[PDB]
Amino acid sequence: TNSQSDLDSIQAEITQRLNEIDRVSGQTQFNGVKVLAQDNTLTIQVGAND
Amino acid sequence: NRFTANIKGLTQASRNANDGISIAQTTEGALNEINNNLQRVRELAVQSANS
């Protein structure tokens, strides 16, 4: 039932939501560290030992 | 005469020895300060390690 003029608006919403989950993960930071932009290991020194 | 010489030498020797203790204490103060500085450096290194 949904027309193609409906699917244009639903696609406009879907691309805006996906641009938003690209933005909020692309530029978010704790102390200048992009947490979700790239994959890496953060190592925590939790002890006096090496 | 021999005893007088020994007594003089022992007292004077005793008088110089106190000085050795004083020098050790002086070195220890500096060493203690160095140790205090070092403790902070180690803590800073631990803080620095995090990703």
UniProtKB/TrEMBL annotation, chain A:
Q: Where in the cell is it found?
A: Secreted; Bacterial flagellum
| TM spans (from-to) | none
State its role: Flagellin is the subunit protein which polymerizes to form the filaments of bacterial flagella.
| Homology family | Belongs to the bacterial flagellin family.
- What is the protein name for this chain? Flagellin
